[PDB]
Amino acid sequence: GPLGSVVRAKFNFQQTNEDELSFSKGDVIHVTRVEEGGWWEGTHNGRTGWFPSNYVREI
Amino acid sequence: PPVIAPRPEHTKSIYTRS
Structure with a gap:
């Protein structure tokens, strides 16, 4: 699943x-939380935060 | 860029400050 995905x-x-x-x-994001609705939470490098789930793609 | 859905309340916390 997307949770824990990169x-x-x-x-x-x-x-x-x-x-x-x-x-x-191009930023690699580690998905740390998945919620329906268009937003996931994850981290990229030293930052964490919610971001639009449709702004990323599975690697 | 793709359409960004409004932050759903279930993804918010007191930290969802704008």
Whole structure:
């Protein structure tokens, strides 16, 4: 499943909330939480946060 | 870029500050 998966940002995403994970296309993200609704939580490098699940793709 | 759904409440916490 996506939980615990490693995905890659397909598009740049700029957080709109402090708990969101900004990232650039190509960024590798570790999915740490999956919720239905368009957002997952995960980490990229030293950052953590929610991000649009449709902004990433499985590697 | 793709459409970003509004943050669902079930993904929010007191840390969901804008």
